[PDB]
Amino acid sequence: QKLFVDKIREYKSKR
Amino acid sequence: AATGRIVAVIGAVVDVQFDEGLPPILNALEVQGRETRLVLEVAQHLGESTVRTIAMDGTEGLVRGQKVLDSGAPIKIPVGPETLGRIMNVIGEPIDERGPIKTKQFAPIHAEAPEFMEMSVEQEILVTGIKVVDLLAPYAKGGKIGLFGGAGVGKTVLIMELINNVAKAHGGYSVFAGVGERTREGNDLYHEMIESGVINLKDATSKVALVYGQMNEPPGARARVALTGLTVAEYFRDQEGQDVLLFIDNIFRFTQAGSEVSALLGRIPSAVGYQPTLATDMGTMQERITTTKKGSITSVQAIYVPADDLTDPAPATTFAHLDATTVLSRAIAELGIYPAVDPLDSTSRIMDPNIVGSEHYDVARGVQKILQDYKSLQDIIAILGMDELSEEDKLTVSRARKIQRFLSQPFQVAEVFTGHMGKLVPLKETIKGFQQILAGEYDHLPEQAFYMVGPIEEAVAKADKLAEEH
Amino acid sequence: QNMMRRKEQEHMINWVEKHVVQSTIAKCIADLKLLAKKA
Amino acid sequence: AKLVRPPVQVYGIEGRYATALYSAASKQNKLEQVEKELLRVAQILKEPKVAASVLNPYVKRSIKVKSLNDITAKERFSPLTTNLINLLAENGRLSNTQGVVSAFSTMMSVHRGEVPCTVTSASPLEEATLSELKTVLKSFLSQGQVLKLEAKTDPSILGGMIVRIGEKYVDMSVKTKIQKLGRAMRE
Amino acid sequence: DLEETGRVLSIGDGIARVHGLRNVQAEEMVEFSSGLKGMSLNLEPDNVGVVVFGNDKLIKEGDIVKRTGAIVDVPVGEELLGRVVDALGNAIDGKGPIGSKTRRRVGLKAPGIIPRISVREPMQTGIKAVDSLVPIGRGQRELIIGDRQTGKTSIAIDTIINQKRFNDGSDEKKKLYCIYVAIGQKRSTVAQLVKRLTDADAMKYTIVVSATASDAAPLQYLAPYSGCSMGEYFRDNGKHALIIYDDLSKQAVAYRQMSLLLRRPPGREAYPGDVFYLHSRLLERAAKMNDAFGGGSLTALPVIETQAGDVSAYIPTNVISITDGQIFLETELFYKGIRPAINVGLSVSRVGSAAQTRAMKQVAGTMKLELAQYREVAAFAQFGSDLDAATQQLLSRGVRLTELLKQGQYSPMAIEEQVAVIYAGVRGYLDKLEPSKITKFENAFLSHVVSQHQALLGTIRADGKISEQSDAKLKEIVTNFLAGFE
Amino acid sequence: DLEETGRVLSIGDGIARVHGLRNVQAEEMVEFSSGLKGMSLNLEPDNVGVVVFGNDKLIKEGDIVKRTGAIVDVPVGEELLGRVVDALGNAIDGKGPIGSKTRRR
Amino acid sequence: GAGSIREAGGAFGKREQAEEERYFRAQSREQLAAL
Ligand SMILES: Nc1ncnc2c1ncn2[C@@H]1O[C@H](COP(=O)(O)OP(=O)(O)OP(=O)(O)O)[C@@H](O)[C@H]1O
Ligand SMILES: Nc1ncnc2c1ncn2[C@@H]1O[C@H](COP(=O)(O)OP(=O)(O)O)[C@@H](O)[C@H]1O
Ligand SMILES: [Mg+2]
Ligand SMILES: [Mg+2]
C-alpha cells in the first residue's frame, strides 16, 4: 500500500 | 553525459549515432574536437539509435565518426540583468568582445507557452507619437504589433523610430532580437544605442539586451535566435515582473530558416515550398511572446512580406498572431509619403469606440472612409478627367489628398534621408488635426502644407511660409 | 485567502510526494500474489 | 504457389528472405535442420577474412558467388541452405544475411512456443521469487509455451517490477503508482 | 491492469512510428509512457503511425505505448455550458473538472435521409443584413467566408449574444445553445472572446472549445469534431444547438501537416486527397431532426478566411460546395463605412424565406428586390443627377436601405425591431430624409418604439407577422416620429 | 587504406559516389586518380558524394580518390592583379603561374 | 476594385496621376497667391 503509506504518513507529516 | 558519433553530414543536417543514452529531442549536443563551439540541436529520432540534428554553426570540417557529447538539456542561455548592454548569439555566447556574461542563472531556449488561465485582457493604448499609427491602428501596452512590408518599404526605419521613442520613454528593460538580418544594421543599431545612452559600456545601467543571428548564419541559428531573444525577454517578464519591450527584426527569417532544412529533414514540402509544420512552429514560437498575469511584454515584430504578397503563407499565418498590424505599402512609399503605412490595410484590436473614445474612433473611421471614397473616385478621374467632377467630389478629393499628406511625418531617425527634423505628435493633436481637416477648416490651404509636418499648427506655419515665398 | 490557499496546498502536495521518495520484500512477494490473483 | 507463412511476421529484405526460407523448409519438413545450418552459416560469415570478402563492393559478384558457393560446399549443407546462400549472393543481399538469419531464428523462436518476457526490477532479485514468478507466469500462457525470462535491474523504478510478457505489459513498479495517485491528488 | 503495448521505432515532428500494437484499431487512442496521448492514423504492416497529442520532446525511441481500446470520445452534456475546454474536453479555465455523465465519440456518422425534416425555423442572428437578406434556419450550414479582419468573428459573436433573449425566456422550443470552437487562434484572443461573452452574460449557454496555435496539429484537427459531438448531444435530445468553427482553414492546415508528415500522397496545394471528406463529414452532422427523433437541430456556422478574396482556392471551394449558403464579407465595403461588411450580391442562403418569420418575409422581399435594382443601377452613381427620375429614385432608395443595414458591434437587434426598421425603410418613409441622418434616425426611432410602443412590438413578436392592425399602427408611429424628427 | 583513400563506387553527371574515405571532412578537396579535383559535399554512412571540378569523362568506376586534408581554398594576394583566373585560382590568361604566397578558404 | 485603374499602373493610371497633379498644382498656385 505504498501510496496509502504516503497518504496517511504524509498528511500526518503536514499536520 | 552520453557520447555518440557523427555518421552523416548533409548541408546543415547532421546524423549522430548514440550507443548508450539517446538524447531527447531538442537537446543541445556539442561536437568534440573543434576550434569554436559547434552545437547540434536534436530534431528527430531516426530509429536504430540514430538522431537527426540541425547545426547551429557551419558544418565544414566535420568528419564521420567525430565524437559528439550530450549536454542533457536544450540550448541554455544566460539570463539576468547582466545580459543588459551585451550582445549574445543563438547559443548565448557574448559576441561583443566585452568578456563573458556572468549571470547567476541559465534558461533553456525551449519552454512551454503560458496557459490560458494566465492570460490578461487589459487593453491600454500605447501612444507612439506617430500620426498614422496612433490615429488609425494604435498600439496597446502589452500587445503584439507586427509590421508588414516588402523589401525596402521602411520596416527597419519604423522599428528604429519605435525603439527611439518608446524605449527612451520606457523604463522596463527592452530586448532586441536580430533574426537573419543584415550585420551592417546590427552594428548601426548597436552604435546608435551606445551613443544614445541606452547601452552603457561603463557604470552598468544599460536597459537593452541584444541577441543577434544574421543572414550569414546557417538555417539552424537563424531559426533559434528568435527563441533566444524570446527567452531573455521571458526571464525579464517572469522572474522580475518588469514590463518588457521585445523588438524582433525580422521574424519572417525564422519561418524561412525552417524551410531551408525542411526537405533535408525528410519532409514533403507544403504549398509555396514551405515546411509542412509552418503554422505549428509559428504557433509554439509566438504563443510565448505574450503578456501574462505575472508580467507584460510589448512586442514589435518586423515581418518581411515576400514580393509584396501578403497572401504568402508566412505573412498570412503571422497575421492571426498579432493585436495591431501595421502594413507598409510600396504604392504609398512611391508617392513620397513616409511612413508608408497603408491606412486601408492596417488594423488594431483597440480601434474600438469603447476603448479609444468615440471622438478618436469617429475621426479614424472618417479618415478611412474619405480615403476609400478617393480610391473610388480616381477611376472617374482617369476616365472623365478632373474638370468634370461634381463639386462635392472635388472637395472629397482635395480633403483626401490633404489627409494623405498629413498622415506623413518626419522621423528623428530619418533625418539623413529627409534632412528634416524629427517630430513627435501627441495623440490629442493628431485627433484634432485630422478632425479639422475632415471638417473643412483648411480647405484654403494648399496640400503641400501638410507634407512632412507635425501638428496642424506646423501645417499652418508651413503654408504661411510657402505663400510668403511665392 | 484563496490564492494563498492555492499556492500552499500546491506546495504541500508536491512536498508530500517528494517526501516519500526519500522513504521491501513484502511488496515483491505481494506483487507475485497479485499476479496470481490476476487469473 | 501457396506459401507456408510463419506464425510471426518480419518485414523488409530480412523478412522476405526469412519467410521464403521458412515456407520452403516447412514444405519438406526440415525446419530444425535449416535452422541449425543458418546458425552455422552466420557464424561462418562473421569470420574476419570472409566478412571482408563479402562486404567488399568492388569485388565482382561472379567471383563472390563462386566463393560463397564453394565455401558452402566445404560444409555439406542442405540444398535449401545452399540455394538460399546462392540466392543472397546472386541478388547482392549478402550484407543482410545475418539479419535474415536472425529473422528466421526469431521465427522459429516462436515456433517452439518460446514466449519472450522481461521483468525489470529495482535491485537484482534472488532466485526463490524468480521460480515463484516463473510458475505464476506460465499460467498466463496458452497451450504449450515456455517462458524466456530476462530479469533486468534498474533502481530508477525504486520498487515494484515491470513485467513485459510478450506484448502484454503490467506496471507493478512503485514510481508509476506514486505518479498516478499524485496526479489523482492534483486532478 | 494488463495492457497490450508497442515500442516507439522512431519519433519526429509529432509522428511516432511504433512497433507492435498488433490489435490497435484505426483511429484508436493510445497512451505513451510519458503520459502523452496519441491517435493511430496509419496502420501499416510493420509499424503504426501515431499522431501525438502534445510535444514530441517527451517521447523517445524505445518508449512503451499502451492501447486504450477506444476510439476518441469526449464528454458531452449540459455540464459543459459556461466552460472553456480543450479539444478533448478537459477544462482549461481552472473552474474544476467537468461533472459530465455521458461520453460521445467524436467520429460518429451524420443522420441519414429519413431522420431529417426540412429547415423551417429561423435562427435569429440579430444582424439586420443577415436576418433580412441571408436568412439562416435551424439545421442549416451557413458559411461565413471572407478575407482577414473583415468582421467574421463579430458575426459569430453577435449571433451568440443574440440568443440571450430566447435563453432567458420560458419558451423551450426557441432556446439555442451555442458552441464556439476556436482553432489555431491565440490564447489571448480566446480570452478576449470569453471575456466579451461573459460581459454579455452569454457564457451560461455557451461552450468554448479551444485548440489554440501552440496546441499540436492533432488537437486542432480534432477540435471541430469534439465541438460537433457536444452539439450533437443537444441535437439528439430535442434541443437546438448552434456551432461556430473559427475557422476551418486552420483545421485544414493542421490536417495537411499531419498528412504530409505521415507521408500520405499530397494533392493540390499539398492537401491530402480526403480533405473534402474531412470537412464534409464534419458538416453533414448539422441537421434538423423530425419530430419522430425529438425535433432537435444543430446549426453550423463554419468560418473560412480567403486570401485576396480568392474563393477559387481549394478549401474555400470545398466548403462552399458543402454548405447551404454563404455570408460573404468585403474589406472594401468595410472601409466604405458599410459595417457589417456583408456583400449582399454575393451572399446567398439556399434555405431562404423558409427560414424567416412572416413579418421579416413581408419587409425583406421588398428590401431584397429594391436593393437588387439598386445594385443594377448603382454604377450610374457619380452621374445620378443626369438620368431619369426613376433611376434617381432607385439610387435614393438603394442608399437609404444600404445605410439601413449598418449596425454596431455587439448589439444584436430583436426581430420585431428589425422588422419595424425595415418597414420604415421599404415603405418610403425615409426618402425625404437625407442619407447622412438615416443611421441617427434609425437609433432615435428605435428608442421611441422601444419606450412608448411595447404593445406593437409584443404583438408582432407574438404573431410573427404584421397584420392589418399592426400595419396601420406601425404606419402611424412611423409617420408621427418622422414628422416630429429633427 | 580506406581512411585517407577511397574508391569510386559510381560516376555520372559530374557526381561521384565514393567508397571509403572515412577521414574526409565536409567540404574537403579530394583528388581523383586522373588529376581532377572534387569537393566532398555529402558525407553519408556508406559513401561520400563528391562533386567533380571538371569533366567526369576521365573518372571511371574503381578509380582511386585521395585526400588533400584541406578545405577548399584559393590563392590570394596582389599577384592576382591583372590576371584572368578560373574558379580555383589557376591562371587562364596564358601568362604563367601566379606567385601567390597566401591561400584563403 | 475601387482604385484598380491606378493600382495597375499603365497608361490609364499614369494619365490619372498626371491629371490630378495638374489640377492640384493649379489649385495650390491659386491658393497660395491668395494668402
Ligand atoms: N459591425 C462592426 N462595426 C464596427 N466595427 C466592427 C464591426 N464588426 C467588426 N468590426 C471590427 O472590425 C475588426 C475585425 O473584425 P473581426 O476580428 O471580428 O473579423 P475576423 O475576420 O475574425 O478577423 P481575424 O482575421 O483576426 O480573424 C474588429 O476590430 C472589429 O472590432
Ligand atoms: N520613415 C522614412 N523616411 C524617409 N525615408 C525612408 C523612411 N523609411 C524608409 N525610407 C527609405 O526607404 C529605404 C528602405 O528603408 P528600410 O528601413 O531598410 O526598409 P525595409 O526594412 O523594409 O527593408 C530607406 O533607405 C529609406 O531611404
Ligand atoms: Mg530592414
Ligand atoms: Mg476571427
Helix residue spans in E323-453 (DSSP H): 331-335, 358-377, 389-405, 415-426, 435-452
CB B236 within 8 A of CB B171: no
Name the architecture of domain B358-465: Orthogonal Bundle (1.10)
Which residues in chain G have their CB less than 8 angstroms from residue B464's CB?
Answer: 35
**Direct distance between the N- and C-terminal alpha carbons of chain C, in angstroms, rounded to an integer:** 51
In three-state secondary structure terms, C32 is helix
Q: How many CA atoms lie within 13 A of B189 on its CB side?
A: 30
CB contact under 8 A, A6 and D178: yes
Alpha-carbon distance of C19 to A4, in angstroms, equals: 14
Instruction: Give which of E142, E112, E143, E102 is closest to E289, Cα–Cα.
Output: E112
- All cell numbers assigned to D152: 533486468
Q: How many CA atoms lie within 13 A of B337 on its CB side?
A: 23
In our burial notation (b when 16+ CB lie closer than 10 A, e otherwise), range F54-86 reads eebeebeeebebebeeeebebbeeeebeeeeee
Distance of CA B427 from the midpoint of ligand 3 (Å): 27
Neighbours of ion ligand 3 (CB under 5 A): B 156
Instruction: Give which of E382, E205, D109, D59 is closest to G2, Cα–Cα.
Output: E382
CB D148 within 8 A of CB D114: yes
- B209 phi, psi to nearest 5 deg: -110, 135
- On the 0-12 / 13-18 / 19+ scale of CB atoms within 10 A, F48 is buried
Alpha-carbon distance of F6 to F23, in angstroms, equals: 10
Closest alpha carbon within chain B to F28: B61
Please give the distance of CA F80 from its chain centroid, rounded to a whole number.
Answer: 21
D8: left (phi over 0), alpha (psi -120 to 50) or beta: beta
- All cell numbers assigned to E32: 505513451
CB contact under 8 A, G16 and B381: yes
Q: How many CB pairs under 8 A join A and C?
A: 21
Torsion of CA E446, E452, E457, E458, to 10 degrees: 150
CB E9 within 8 A of CB E47: yes
Determine the residue type at D58: Y
- All cell numbers assigned to F29: 578537396
Instruction: Find the discontinuities in chain C where C to next N exceeds 2.5 angstroms and give the residue preceding each.
Output: 23
**Direct distance between the N- and C-terminal alpha carbons of chain D, in angstroms, rounded to an integer:** 59
Let me know how many helices (H) and strands (E) chain B has, helices first.
15, 17
CB B313 within 8 A of CB B303: no
Q: Which residue's CA lies nearest to atom 30 of ligand 1?
A: E151
- E259 phi, psi to nearest 5 deg: -70, -50
Alpha-carbon distance of B248 to B229, in angstroms, equals: 8
Name the experiment that determined this structure. cryo-EM
Determine the residue type at D102: S
Alpha-carbon distance of D185 to A6, in angstroms, equals: 12
Alpha-carbon distance of E17 to E263, in angstroms, equals: 12
Instruction: Report which secondary-structure segment, H or E, holds B281.
Output: helix B278-286
Known binding-site residue numbers of E for Mg(2+): 153, 246
Instruction: Give which of E195, E101, E108 is closest to E208, Cα–Cα.
Output: E195
Q: Return the DSSP state at B167.
A: I
Cβ(B339) – ligand 2 distance below 6 Å: yes
Cβ(E307) – ligand 1 distance below 6 Å: no
Q: Give how far E95 is from chain D: nearest CA, Å.
A: 12
Cβ(E412) – ligand 1 distance below 6 Å: no
Which residues in chain D have their CB less than 8 angstroms from residue A2's CB?
Answer: 159, 174, 177-178
CB E197 within 8 A of CB E236: no
- On the 0-12 / 13-18 / 19+ scale of CB atoms within 10 A, E236 is middle
Instruction: Give which of E117, E296, E292, E92 is closest to E194, Cα–Cα.
Output: E92
Distances in Å between the Cα of E59 and the Cα atoms of E51, E215, F87 are 12, 16, 48
Neighbours of ion ligand 4 (CB under 5 A): E 153
Q: Are strands E64-71 and E28-32 parallel, antiparallel or unpaired?
A: antiparallel
Cβ(B338) – ligand 2 distance below 6 Å: yes
In D123-152, the residues whose Cβ lies within 8 Å of chain C are 125, 129, 132-133, 136-137, 139-140
Let me know how many helices (H) and strands (E) chain D has, helices first.
8, 4
The CATH classification number of B76-348 equals 3.40.50.300
Which of E350, E375, E397, E461 is flagged as catalytic? Answer: E350
Distance of CA E438 from the midpoint of ligand 4 (Å): 29
What range does the domain containing D32 cover? 12-110
Distances in Å between the Cα of B371 and the Cα atoms of B343, B365, E158, E330, F95 are 8, 10, 28, 16, 68
Cβ(B349) – ligand 1 distance below 6 Å: yes
Q: Return the DSSP state at B445.
A: S
Count of other CB atoms within 10 angstroms of residue F93: 10
Resolution in A: 2.6
CB contact under 8 A, C16 and A14: yes
Cβ(B155) – ligand 2 distance below 6 Å: yes
CB neighbour list of residue B116: distance below 8 Å, 6 or more residues apart: E84, E92, E93, E187, E190, E191, E210, E212
In our burial notation (b when 16+ CB lie closer than 10 A, e otherwise), range B138-170 reads bbbbbbbbbbbbbeebbbbbbbbbbbbbbbeeb
**Direct distance between the N- and C-terminal alpha carbons of chain E, in angstroms, rounded to an integer:** 80
Rounded to 10°, the helix B456-469/B427-439 angle is: 60
Alpha-carbon distance of G17 to G19, in angstroms, equals: 5
- Structural domain spans, chain B: 3-75, 76-348, 358-465
Q: Give how far B12 is from chain F: nearest CA, Å.
A: 11
Alpha-carbon distance of B183 to B189, in angstroms, equals: 10
Q: How many CA atoms lie within 13 A of B374 on its CB side?
A: 21
Provide the strand spans (E) within B263-307: 296-304
Determine the residue type at B16: V
Alpha-carbon distance of B435 to B432, in angstroms, equals: 5
Determine the residue type at G3: G
Cβ(E409) – ligand 1 distance below 6 Å: yes
DSSP assignment string, E404-434:
HH---TT-PPPHHHHHHHHHHHHTTTTSSS-
Alpha-carbon distance of F33 to F52, in angstroms, equals: 12
Helix residue spans in B287-426 (DSSP H): 313-318, 330-333, 353-356, 358-384, 391-407, 415-418
What range does the domain containing E165 cover? 74-359
Alpha-carbon distance of B173 to B245, in angstroms, equals: 7
Cβ(B159) – ligand 2 distance below 6 Å: no
Which residues in chain D have their CB less than 8 angstroms from residue C20's CB?
Answer: 178
Q: How many CB pairs under 8 A join A and D?
A: 10
Which residues in chain D have their CB less than 8 angstroms from residue E20's CB?
Answer: 167
Distance of CA E153 from the midpoint of ligand 1 (Å): 7
Distance of CA E246 from the midpoint of ligand 4 (Å): 7
Distance of CA B330 from the midpoint of ligand 2 (Å): 11
Mutate to test the interface with F, among B60, B66, B67, B264 (most CBs of F within 10 A): B60
Chains C and B touch (3+ CB pairs under 8 A): no
What is the greatest pairwise CA distance in chain E? 87
Domain B3-75 = CATH 2.40.10.170: yes
Does the annotation flag B146 for ligand binding? no
Rounded to 10°, the helix E217-236/E275-283 angle is: 30
The answer to whether the Cα torsion of B251, B253, B257, B262 is positive or negative is positive
In three-state secondary structure terms, B208 is strand
Q: Which residue's CA lies nearest to atom 6 of ligand 2?
A: B154
CB contact under 8 A, E257 and B280: yes
D74: left (phi over 0), alpha (psi -120 to 50) or beta: alpha
Instruction: Report which secondary-structure segment, H or E, holds E10.
Output: strand E3-12
Alpha-carbon distance of B71 to B23, in angstroms, equals: 9
CB contact under 8 A, D169 and E45: no
Residue B385 in contact with partner chain F when CB distance is under 8 A: no
The answer to whether the Cα torsion of E162, E168, E169, E173 is positive or negative is positive
Instruction: Report which secondary-structure segment, H or E, holds B227.
Output: helix B219-238
Which residues in chain D have their CB less than 8 angstroms from residue E2's CB?
Answer: 168-170
Alpha-carbon distance of D176 to D162, in angstroms, equals: 10
CB E369 within 8 A of CB E144: no
Count of other CB atoms within 10 angstroms of residue E364: 22
- All cell numbers assigned to E229: 459531438
- D179 phi, psi to nearest 5 deg: -65, -40
Q: Is the peptide bond before B89 cis (omega within 30 degrees of 0)?
A: no
Rounded to 10°, the helix B219-238/B251-262 angle is: 140
CB F32 within 8 A of CB F63: yes
Distances in Å between the Cα of E214 and the Cα atoms of B119, B224, B282, B283, E217 are 14, 17, 8, 5, 9
Per-residue H/E/C for B344-359: CCCCCCCCCHHHHCHH
Alpha-carbon distance of B393 to B379, in angstroms, equals: 12
Provide the strand spans (E) within F1-105: 5-12, 15-20, 28-32, 37-43, 48-52, 64-71, 74-76, 102-104
- All cell numbers assigned to A7: 497518504
Instruction: Give which of E237, E319, E314 is closest to E282, Cα–Cα.
Output: E319
In three-state secondary structure terms, E325 is strand
Distance of CA E152 from the midpoint of ligand 1 (Å): 7
Q: Give how far A2 is from chain D: nearest CA, Å.
A: 7
Instruction: Give which of B6, B16, B23 is closest to B71, Cα–Cα.
Output: B23
One fold for both B3-75 and B76-348?
A: no
Q: How many CA atoms lie within 13 A of F77 on its CB side?
A: 10
- All cell numbers assigned to B105: 542563472
Q: Give how far D181 is from chain C: nearest CA, Å.
A: 9
**CATH number of the domain enclosing E296:** 3.40.50.300
- On the 0-12 / 13-18 / 19+ scale of CB atoms within 10 A, D9 is middle
Alpha-carbon distance of C32 to C38, in angstroms, equals: 10
Alpha-carbon distance of F93 to G4, in angstroms, equals: 56
- All cell numbers assigned to E373: 435594382
